[PDB]
């Protein structure tokens, strides 16, 4: 542990060999054992500053990062006939209240005393679990629970037909039709579009589906009152037939324009009466009708930081979908510029999310083909909640002032979530509106009201409790370096859209400068507290990431999609992306976790992201969260080539290698176990490709060695040198 002080100039090896654990709030033993899991709910400062003045002096951002709908191992479900809430601020009774009269409880957020209803009260499950799910009563619904409604909207233009994406998507829908969340009330629908809009009717009385073409692009309408959204249970056979015919109907298409705007307007009209989830697959710039977007020239390594949408059509449309409980998920499989900076608004403000597959092609791009396959598997089978809202409460004195993530902020800070999905993350920024001189603990409560895929109104509640400190040092001792990096990234993305990429990159650098300068003016080299010894490293990693990098050759839609991930992803996968984990894997052995039964999993140490840590003699696995890259050195041992890769020499390693073979060797068993254990830590199955040789030109592997200098960015050492010059200026 330690309250020690570190000189970043003399260490340079501060990154530990074992995974980073989130800090433990400085709380009494019995309080901390009840606290919310940090994977679900965590704060940038585990010790809340008592006043806004103290928060300002530390020059660190105060905020929460939440993963509210995350898949859980075990979830207590109270079905109580009554839900116990505070009569003033409607806070749910939670483990951190104060029982006094044993029939009266004091709210930990508004301090009002309440009456425990005749319904050992501190033994009740609502007071033993920081995370709990309630059944909602009749008053908590505006309407009967909506059924699950899935509408798939496919681009079928000539460019789309060429990518061949339709074949895999229709195959995944076929394989996963019985796994779609829902009961017998589930409805499914299909729309394709090119210059016109194509609905599909499904009837057991008709020999085949029927394609209904709306050609009036300026005045779309629903051509049929029934059978466009059909009951999946009743019409399973008709849906399966359609999915087999769709990839073959447009082989010889000469349509080259795409009317994405009008298609979404018709898709909205079709979903308006029920709500649900709308999956949109688009492969090019929208060029026809409302929502047309102008072409643009991609930047190169030479242009400086000189982002925002080009129209508000998709934001307005997304706002209308939010009002009807419709969420739009965007799958952009484009080979050229598509103005994602404007298309992304359809998902940001409707609580959807965007998935990007640059230069998808069924024959030319095997990596993107397998990536879409695996991401669609998760998309179609994960749990889902409909027509949802979220409220976030904190103790009197603390005020949320900025929200980050995919939703719509209604009045009085109701977060509107047409869909809630278990892979979405959110962030919130707060300030101390009133001095916390009164209390010594503060609490945070998020509550998610949603409709399950079974038709049951449920409320998921998480409650977090933290202590209040009154000195600069205690603020620094509780700092969570990763959560600070996450919130800063969300803030820099907003700064980019609001100002420029230069301003966002400056404010990121100045966050390190001002914080360490504040620390220095309150104690030669660059002295940081132990809890911030990775702060310049992660911030430098932020500045070389695809969201904020400068002198690189990055294309517009790449940068936008990297920002959309910052806004939407949970903290963990933002850390795995910004600062991938680097292990040596040609020499695994038996210091592992041999604990999980018959498996022995090696546990190689984490290396720092420098080419100095590589070796032409070995092999190195890089865990980047969504993908795993296995780099083989040119001078790699013959044991690793034959016993792990299945190849007699470096030259016969196939160019795209989409995975490792499973050979009958112990070295093979070790690396397969280590890789197995890595992807079991997550639901989004990450693809491994071993192709990163030194010659396949796929070694963007090196774009992640964030400690090394490049022609357009500093090294980690240069960075520390620049911080120090600014700190004691």
């Amino acid at each position: 542990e330690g309250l020690r002080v570190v000189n970043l100039l003399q260490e340079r090896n501060m990154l530990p060999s074992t995974p980073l654990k989130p800090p433990v709030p400085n709380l009494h033993e019995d309080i901390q054992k009840l606290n919310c899991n940090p994977e679900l709910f965590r704060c940038t400062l585990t010790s809340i500053p008592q006043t806004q003045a103290l928060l300002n002096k530390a020059k660190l951002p105060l905020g929460l990062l939440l993963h509210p709908f995350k898949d859980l191992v075990q979830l207590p479900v109270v079905t109580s006939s009554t839900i116990v809430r505070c009569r003033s601020c409607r806070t749910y009774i939670n483990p951190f209240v104060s029982f006094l009269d044993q029939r009266r409880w004091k709210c930990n957020l508004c301090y009002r005393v309440n009456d425990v209803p005749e319904e050992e009260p501190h033994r009740r499950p609502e007071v033993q679990n920081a995370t709990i799910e309630f059944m909602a009563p009749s008053e908590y619904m505006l309407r009967p629970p909506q059924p699950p409604v899935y509408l798939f909207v496919f681009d079928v233009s000539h460019n789309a037909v060429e990518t061949g994406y339709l074949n895999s998507v229709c195959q995944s829908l076929l394989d996963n039709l019985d796994l779609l969340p829902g009961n017998t009330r589930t409805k499914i629908g299909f729309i394709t579009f090119d210059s016109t809009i194509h609905f599909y009717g499904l009837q057991e009385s008709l020999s085949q589906p029927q394609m209904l073409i709306v050609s009036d692009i300026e005045d779309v309408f629903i051509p049929m009152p029934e059978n466009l959204l059909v009951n999946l249970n009743e019409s399973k056979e008709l849906v399966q037939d359609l999915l087999k015919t769709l990839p073959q109907m447009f082989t010889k298409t000469l349509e080259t324009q795409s009317a994405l705007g009008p298609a979404l307007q018709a898709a909205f009209k079709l979903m308006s009466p029920t709500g649900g989830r709308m999956s949109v697959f688009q492969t090019q710039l929208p060029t026809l009708g409302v929502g047309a977007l102008k072409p643009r020239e991609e930047p190169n390594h030479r242009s400086s930081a000189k982002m925002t949408p080009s129209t508000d059509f998709y934001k307005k449309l997304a706002l209308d979908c939010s009002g009807q409980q419709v969420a739009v998920d965007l799958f952009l499989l484009s080979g050229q510029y598509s103005d994602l900076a404007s298309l992304g608004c359809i998902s940001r403000y409707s609580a959807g999310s965007v998935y990007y597959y640059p230069s998808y092609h069924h024959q030319h791009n095997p990596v993107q083909v397998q990536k879409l396959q695996k991401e669609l598997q998760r998309y179609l089978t994960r749990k889902i909640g409909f027509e949802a809202v979220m409220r976030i409460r904190c103790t009197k004195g603390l005020s949320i002032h900025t929200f980050h993530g995919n939703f719509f902020v209604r009045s009085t800070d109701l977060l509107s979530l047409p869909n809630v999905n278990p892979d979405a993350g959110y962030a919130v920024q707060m300030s101390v509106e009133e001095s916390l001189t009164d209390t010594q603990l503060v609490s945070f409560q998020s509550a998610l009201l949603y409709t399950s895929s079974k038709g049951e109104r449920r409320i998921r509640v998480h409650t977090l409790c933290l202590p209040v400190v009154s000195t600069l040092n205690d603020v620094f001792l509780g700092a969570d370096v990763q959560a600070i990096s996450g919130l800063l990234a969300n803030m820099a993305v907003d700064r980019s859209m609001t100002a420029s990429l230069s301003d966002a990159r400056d404010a990121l650098v100045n966050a390190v400068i001002d914080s360490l300068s504040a620390y220095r003016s309150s104690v030669p080299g660059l002295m940081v507290p132990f809890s911030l010894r990775l702060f310049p490293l992660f911030v430098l990693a932020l500045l070389k990431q695809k969201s904020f990098q400068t002198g690189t050759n990055a294309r517009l839609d790449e940068r936008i999609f990297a920002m959309c991930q910052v806004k939407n992803q949970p903290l963990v996968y933002l850390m795995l992306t910004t600062h991938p984990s680097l292990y040596r894997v040609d020499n695994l052995s038996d210091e592992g976790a041999l604990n999980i039964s018959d498996r022995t999993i090696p546990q190689p140490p984490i290396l720092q992201l420098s080419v100095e840590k590589l070796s032409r003699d070995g092999a190195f696995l890089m865990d980047a969260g969504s993908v795993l890259m296995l780099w083989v050195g040119k001078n790699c041992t013959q044991n690793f080539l034959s016993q792990v890769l299945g190849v007699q020499n470096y030259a016969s390693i196939p160019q795209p290698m989409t995975d490792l073979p499973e050979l009958d060797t112990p070295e093979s068993a070790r690396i397969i176990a280590f890789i197995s254990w890595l992807r079991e830590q997550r639901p989004f199955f990450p693809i491994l490709y071993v192709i990163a040789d030194e010659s396949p030109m796929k070694a963007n592997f090196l774009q992640n060695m964030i400690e090394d200098r490049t022609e357009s960015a500093l090294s980690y050492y240069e960075f520390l040198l620049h911080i120090q010059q600014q700190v004691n200026k």
Binding site: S81, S138, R143, P144, T184, K269, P273
Partner: protein, 135 residues
């Protein structure tokens, strides 16, 4: 001559099954839940209420209330024939589980039969009071 169907347990007004399609709903859905609250063991078991351009119809069987709303011009004869079709089906399927449930809409899946039955009445091919009184 359109729609709003709700099936509720008379005692506490617990909703059991409903079905509504728009493409307002908020005012008449409230009035419906008012009715369920007021109705008790002394209430008329077959009734029609007048809400201006709209008209409520309901029957009460085995402590369960079957309510429908439509424009005042919709044939009152058909509104009650539609409720009997639902009651016989619903009582046959869940009539004995009704008095035990405690969640709202514990029978959402009765949605399906409601709408296949509903379409056999909104296609041409007892007491009377003013709802504002009862409320």
């Amino acid at each position: 001559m359109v729609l709003l169907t709700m099936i509720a347990r008379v005692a506490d007004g617990l909703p059991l099954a409903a079905s509504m399609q728009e493409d307002d709903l908020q005012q008449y859905q409230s009035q419906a839940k008012q009715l369920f609250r007021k109705l008790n063991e002394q209430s008329p078991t077959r009734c029609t209420l007048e809400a201006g351009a709209m008209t409520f119809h309901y029957i009460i069987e085995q402590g369960v209330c079957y309510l429908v709303l439509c424009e005042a011009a919709f044939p009152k004869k058909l509104a009650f024939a539609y409720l009997e079709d639902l009651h016989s089906e619903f009582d046959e399927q869940h009539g004995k589980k009704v008095p035990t449930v405690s969640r709202p809409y514990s029978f959402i899946e009765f949605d399906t039969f409601i709408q296949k039955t509903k379409k056999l009445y909104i296609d041409s091919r007892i007491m009377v009071a003013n709802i504002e009184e009862v409320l």
